[PDB]
Each structure stands twice: as structure tokens, then as C-alpha cells.
Design a protein around this ligand. Structure first.
Ligand code: FMN
Length: 147
């Protein structure tokens, strides 16, 4: 199976998380393409992929709390080929904030409105993901199991 991982990361946490999930899928036999949201184009981005994993960090804001590189993709999610696509989301944040990993909720709800199939509840990491390595790996393992 071919998996697409797209992440938006400012300080590297969600990017480390994306790389960790990418290895777990690769060791399990998937063909994985991992991309920074700052370099992709929304149009047909999901075409040909069996599984798509989207991730991003949350930044307190009055209009949109998604990490900046991910906003253009998020605003054009309806052109990516999300209907009937198997997808799962993940993101890093901090539980000291009211909207803890609120970007994950935002992305899940819009993929659900576009007809995607959410295969697992989202991975929400509090603090340094290097300390949650077990949780990332375990989540990646359960996502493969739902495909
Ligand atoms: C100024 C600022 C605002 C933040 N706002 C939130 C927030 O609204 N919700 C949340 O869960 N985390 C928030 N965080 C925590 C960051 O999302 C967290 O540091 C995350 O690991 C950053 O991930 P990244 O390196 O992949 O961009 C905020 C951090 C900073 C510095």
C-alpha cells in the first residue's frame, strides 16, 4: 500500500512526529511519501494513495489556529481527492492552552465534511514528541490495522 504523510511544523515537533510514523509504516511494508505542507500543491494531491496522514501544530489565534504552512492546503482540501479516502490526523500542541491540539479537530471535521473516511481518532501530542515515541509508534500500528 502507498501512504502520503503531509505535515506543517514550525519548531520541528510535528515534523519529527511525521518522520516517526513514516518509519513505522515503512518497516511494516508500505511505500511512504512524506512531504512538508510548504511544498505541496492541493490539486489532486491525494490521487493514487491508499492512506493519507495529515498533521499540524496549533497556534493560538483569533481567526485560524493552524500552523501557517498548512493553511493553504487546509483552505483547498476540497480539491485534494479526499472523498472516500482513508485518512488519519496527528499534531503536537500543549495542554496549557485551551484549544489543546485544536488543529487536529479542525482538520478531522473538514475531512469528514468532504466525505473522507477517518480510520482512527487523531494522535494529539502534549509537549516533546521525542518523549511520546511509544504513543506515536503504537498509533501508527493501530492505523495500519484499520486499513
Ligand atoms: C505562541 C504559541 C502559541 C501556541 N498555541 C497553542 C495552542 O493554541 N494549542 C496547543 O495545543 N498548543 C499551542 N502551542 C504549543 C505548540 O503547538 C507546540 O509547541 C508544538 O509542539 C509545536 O509544534 P511544531 O514544532 O511541529 O510547529 C503554542 C506554542 C506557542 C509558542
Amino acid at each position: 500500500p502507498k501512504a502520503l504523510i503531509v505535515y506543517g511544523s514550525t519548531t520541528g515537533n510535528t515534523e519529527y512526529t511525521a518522520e516517526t510514523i513514516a518509519r513505522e509504516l515503512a518497516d511494516a511494508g508500505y511505500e511512504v511519501d512524506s512531504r512538508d505542507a510548504a511544498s505541496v500543491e492541493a490539486g489532486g494531491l491525494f490521487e493514487g494513495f491508499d492512506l493519507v496522514l495529515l498533521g499540524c501544530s496549533t497556534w493560538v489565534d483569533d481567526s485560524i489556529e493552524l500552523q501557517d504552512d498548512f493553511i493553504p492546503l487546509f483552505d483547498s482540501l476540497e480539491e485534494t481527492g479526499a472523498q472516500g479516502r482513508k485518512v488519519a490526523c496527528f499534531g503536537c500542541g500543549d495542554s496549557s492552552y485551551e484549544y489543546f491540539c485544536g488543529a487536529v479537530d479542525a482538520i478531522e471535521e473538514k475531512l469528514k465534511n468532504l466525505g473522507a473516511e477517518i480510520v482512527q481518532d487523531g494522535l494529539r501530542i502534549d509537549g516533546d514528541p521525542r518523549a511520546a515515541r511509544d504513543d506515536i509508534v503504537g498509533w501508527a500500528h493501530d492505523v495500519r490495522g484499520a486499513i
